[PDB]
Amino acid sequence: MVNVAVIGAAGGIGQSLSLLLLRELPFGSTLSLYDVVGAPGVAADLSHIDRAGITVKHAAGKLPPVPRDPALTELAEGVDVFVIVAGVPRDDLFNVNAGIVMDLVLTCASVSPNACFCIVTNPVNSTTPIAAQTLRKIGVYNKNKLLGVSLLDGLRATRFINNARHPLVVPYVPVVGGHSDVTIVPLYSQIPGPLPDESTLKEIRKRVQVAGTEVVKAKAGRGSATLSMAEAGARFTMHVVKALMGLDTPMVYAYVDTDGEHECPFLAMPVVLGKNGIERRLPIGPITTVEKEMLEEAVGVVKKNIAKGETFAR
Amino acid sequence: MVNVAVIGAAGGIGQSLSLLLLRELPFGSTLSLYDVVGAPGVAADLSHIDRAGITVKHAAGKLPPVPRDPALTELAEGVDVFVIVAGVPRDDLFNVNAGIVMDLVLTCASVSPNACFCIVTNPVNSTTPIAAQTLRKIGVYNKNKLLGVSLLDGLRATRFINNARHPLVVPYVPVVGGHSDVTIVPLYSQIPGPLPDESTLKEIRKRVQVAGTEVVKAKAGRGSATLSMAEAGARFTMHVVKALMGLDTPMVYAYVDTDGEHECPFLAMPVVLGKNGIERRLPIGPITTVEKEMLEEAVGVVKKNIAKGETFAR
Amino acid sequence: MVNVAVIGAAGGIGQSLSLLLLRELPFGSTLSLYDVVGAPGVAADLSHIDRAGITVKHAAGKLPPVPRDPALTELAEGVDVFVIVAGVPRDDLFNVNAGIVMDLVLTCASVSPNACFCIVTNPVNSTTPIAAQTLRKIGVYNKNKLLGVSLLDGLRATRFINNARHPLVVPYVPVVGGHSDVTIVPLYSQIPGPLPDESTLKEIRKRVQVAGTEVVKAKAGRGSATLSMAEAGARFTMHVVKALMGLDTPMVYAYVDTDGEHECPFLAMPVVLGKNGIERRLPIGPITTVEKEMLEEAVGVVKKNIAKGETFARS
Amino acid sequence: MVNVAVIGAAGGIGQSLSLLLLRELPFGSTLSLYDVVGAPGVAADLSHIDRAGITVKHAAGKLPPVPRDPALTELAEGVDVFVIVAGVPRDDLFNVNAGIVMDLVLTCASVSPNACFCIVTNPVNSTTPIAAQTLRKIGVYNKNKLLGVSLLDGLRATRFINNARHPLVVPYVPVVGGHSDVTIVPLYSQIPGPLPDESTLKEIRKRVQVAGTEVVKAKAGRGSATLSMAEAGARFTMHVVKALMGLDTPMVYAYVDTDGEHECPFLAMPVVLGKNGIERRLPIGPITTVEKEMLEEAVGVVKKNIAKGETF
Amino acid sequence: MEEGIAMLQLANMAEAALAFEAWRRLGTTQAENEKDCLAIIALNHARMLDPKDIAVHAALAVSHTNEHNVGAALQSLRSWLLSQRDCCTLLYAAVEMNPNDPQLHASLGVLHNLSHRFDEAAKNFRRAVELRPDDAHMWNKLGATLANGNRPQEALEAYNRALDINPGYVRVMYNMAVSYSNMAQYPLAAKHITRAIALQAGGTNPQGEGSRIATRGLWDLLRMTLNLMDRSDLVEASWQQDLTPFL
């Protein structure tokens, strides 16, 4: 009933994301896997797992990358949701990642214009508007069908607040703003229960804004956190897939487009998912003074990130 | 509360196995990770997933490997399940794998002798007897809690028979013998439902036998099947953990010791797990003539495999 | 979206069946309860359970039972699954249950002919052919969308064989033949494991055959098994609903129409459920010499039961 | 490895509660059932469902009830959780229910003093303090191991707010105060999302307060809401069982004894469960002025109910 | 014997019971001092001495209904009926045969009291006391029925006019204290409890284990009543069982 395509399924994040999607996709779903190198060897590795009712398709692109790969054009037919997890492992990363995202979205959206796009490429704040501009240039754009995955910040914030207050746990923690370093604004005043005092909540918020670099430091610069982003992408994709066929109407926090609401055009506000993508855009809600200052600081950075992305998009 | 240690957790199989174990382990358990390199990175990566109620430990490796490193001795204290996924990324391969497995089992079993050892490495037919010999050399060998993971063949057989007989779906397929190309025997006769005609069930048995080489051929000789092996290891470890906690008494097929029953000292037969490891060893059951010939040749090969395995460990 | 209507939902069995369904129906489903007495009371009891995404409807009948109830014709519009569980709490019971089953099926199938009917009232070997006769009389009969719920014999056999063979557990036990007393034929031969012994399987099989009256004996003749029947009906309805929307293709044992295959026209054999109801009739399989005579006697009695049901339905 | 004893299993609530608990209890646990009449017929009704790993025990009733029944003394040995759900099907509804609650707690707490008692009987504001006084009389009493089930109010509030805010859905709604007509205070301020409106949220709050009368009136005065109460009791018992095994640390709203804290000795406040009963008693939190007036008005009625229960 | 008979007419019982057909009188007396265990033992002794006695069976039934023992009360009522719901049928048949028997109406009220049908018990007890307005125990049972049936209006028309008949009835003070606690009237309820305790103690002041056990319930009731009116000083003195400060 649903067709899910994972772009860049042979990398470090794509492999684990594909495994987690195969283990959780409903009965009757198909999994499509694409990558420039290694897709044949990843496809004939999840097809040996029983998982009755799921078919694993794949397509391999030429090792020298080319615009509009004929293999990706065939695989893109009939796809309902696209997961863009293709990124090479600061601006020297931004330019190549932006070019890759531009090419991939242009190839995919030319065959399946009515599909959800979930951007998992690292510079989310700068690469989601790039995808939006590419879709606008093609001629088809749906503000409710383009989302940026930013659930890893929520996972980190929930984990840290649960470690701080543990007679007790909470299911989730609201995170708004953006994704990079000072663009993440956790909202600990909206969670039920006593809070672990100020001057410690400050340290927790700082750690959520920094924990991405901590993993890289622990790896001695070899790599980044792949398992965490794989799990977050799999969870968000499952949310979108379940909401697409009317099996849920979840409320999630994602880097989406704001047709009004907030003065920033691409804030990470809470949304409610539905059969047609985004069903309702909820307001941020009441925040304290320090949270208001942090949000005001973050919005300025989001503005220039969006400007840089839309400038690269020409 | 259970303690699960994943030795060699930073490898290709180990990372996915650790991720699935973290996502599936029961509330209040702890996860231990060890490897000669890369353990801190994966430990810091899996710590940011919220997963309330689970703690993650780790023990960094050393310089070029030394026997009985103190880090593993410190980490292996109070561990219930030992999942040994460690091997090089066809006789030199066996020699190195046996050399590392003997030392790994010797180090872990000297501080926690009453733990369950799940050998997940590849020369299972030769590494499980080697682990048994090492445990006997230490002086604490329990035949009821030494398992060899051979669930991948069962998953492959189930997948192929479900593809052949759609829409008639079965949950599992009995597989006996060993864990190599010619030693595994799928028992399709004792499966509910009308089996397909012969001269077609043979081309399925052959495919199950040589299914491992297909993945390597598809990967252009770059790697091997890591996602499916990790999934099989995670499922078997979850079965063992649930059985040890008292929340299940499952029937599994594992490469275990045969006290009586079969003339083969280390055949793979169905067993029933429990609070003390292996509770009941069931007989193989009624089989047809062609399956009897296949079992005869498989036992003949397993004889030499076991003899080779125990020859090295002396 | 699936619309599951429970007929006779305010009785002893229908109440627990309705409560169990509400906790397991998929997101976006509806429940349509109906009964002559007590429909609004049970309807405005499950509406206070949160269960986001599921709506609950109802329609009350009339205290004097009127054939072709106008409320039922309004309630039955746009219904995909019909759970006929309605009977008074041997020859004095069939004559009063068969008529109400006839009327209920005739009223429900006149507005939703494409729905699937599950029969949970008891003279099973004799109310499934009656429903078939009514559907044929209406003008629309589909042998793949008429099922008799005989799953209760599976739970009993599984429980008894699991108690006898602990700690080795089997998920299910095949049961063929019929439903009433001696038409139940458990097939312990085709399950994995070392079966206990003969002269011990005999007493387990006999206990499965007459386990229904044991509950009544333990209840001082004040009722019958009303909690396990609800669980069996809920589980079978879940199987049918899940297979109807494409979320599974389960293999189940149900008292269904035997087109061709077995000589008995309404045996209970394994089937595979799908988008259109039944899609694969499976053979019984290998059977030992002990079970062969049991099945012979079973089919011998089931033929007479079907004949009695058809003769009543054709009067 | 817990023993769950459902006392009053043959009633309207008890049958459905036992059926629900049979399918959700962990592998390796047992179900104990008891009633004055009709317990054998339910025990040899739930024993036919397969449910591998669960054993069903039962104790027969007796001739017209006698104090300190020997059958209960035999059955209540080694029981970890007690689910007191028994009583008659306005003001006469209290004394008859209080006598049998006193008798049941006296019988059960003598053989199993370190167990958990969940009170599902009706005058909830009044029988929980009665169950505490009869426990104090014996000499054993743990404030962390005596809870009053009031989850039905939260279920109703969640259902009523989810219908007015579709498709926005919340999993729970905080409800404090008591378990009666005017003592139920739903705290709609402490939930995410924009609240519908005033002069409309008041209607929802009033509907939550008097929702029990609606079912009674729908049934033409022939019964009460048994399915909803059975579901709520099963959910709370599952929470307690999971917390006792170390498999969870849930945060629930229960009619517990406020150790110090609030001036009302038996308010319904959020608590955190654990291996030893109650681990932490959380404060109510910030509320609006309308909710403040509602709580101030309900506290006096709760105090009067506690006094009436403790006098008898 | 003679001393007990003469003393019992002056509305004092502790001395008479301490002095102790004799089993019947002793048990019927002990039923009036919240000593239901000793009263039941004495009634059982009288019954094993003579089952035919009807007053013995009536007292046993009353005590068993007070003790919440439905089966024992039903058996005692059946024994009383045979001495001269199926038990309900027997009682109804006996009432229909003789619709002017005060004992039959009292038995009907007793049967309706422990069946939680307080309205029919009140009707039967009013009819019975109307037939014989000079029996203190009948008005006793009626007043207990009204008090246990909520709404303790009519402070009491008798049973506190049975006080005008029998001033020394301790069960009077007990039920008045209970009813005053029902209407949150704690001071005079505690006064009635103290008066009942003084009546129980009497002049000889028995120190038997059974007497102390029986008075422990009233002492606990007094302590409970004092807690609601924050009289910690009286609560502390209550542990010594010294009624002099209370009096």
Residue numbers in the entry:
A (entry chain D), B (entry chain A): 1 to 89, 96 to 320
C (entry chain C): 1 to 89, 96 to 321
D (entry chain B): 1 to 89, 96 to 318
E (entry chain E): 363 to 382, 394 to 457, 494 to 656
Which sentences from the paper describe this structure?
Having no protein synthetic abilities, peroxisomes import all required enzymes from the cytosol through a peroxin (Pex) import system. Peroxisome targeting sequence 1 (PTS1)-tagged cargo is recognized by cytosolic receptor, Pex5. The cargo-Pex5 complex docks at the peroxisomal membrane translocon, composed of Pex14 and Pex13, facilitating translocation into the peroxisomal lumen. MDH is a crucial enzyme for the glycolysis auxiliary pathway, maintaining the pool of malate/oxaloacetate.
We successfully reconstructed MP1 and MP2 maps showing one and two copies of Pex5 bound to MDH tetramer, respectively. MP1 and MP2 maps show a well-resolved MDH region, but poorly resolved Pex5 region(s), indicating conformational heterogeneity in the latter component. The refined maps facilitated model building of MDH and Pex5 residues 327–462 and 487–653, encompassing the TPR domain and an upstream helix containing the Wxxx(F/Y) motif (residues 327–345). The helix distinguishes our structure from previously available Pex5 TPR domain crystal structures, in which the Wxxx(F/Y) motif-containing helix is not resolved. Recognition of the MDH by Pex5 is mediated via PTS1 motif at the central cavity of Pex5 TPR domain. Along PTS1-mediated interaction, two additional interfaces between MDH and Pex5 TPR domain are identified by PISA analysis. Interface 1 involves MDH residues 62–70 and Pex5 residues 439–444, forming a loop connecting α6 and α7. To clarify the ambiguity, we reconstituted in vitro and solved the structure of the MDH-Pex5 binary complex devoid of Pex14NTD. The map for the binary complex revealed no density beyond the MDH and Pex5 TPR domain, indicating that the additional density observed in the ternary complex originates from Pex14NTD.
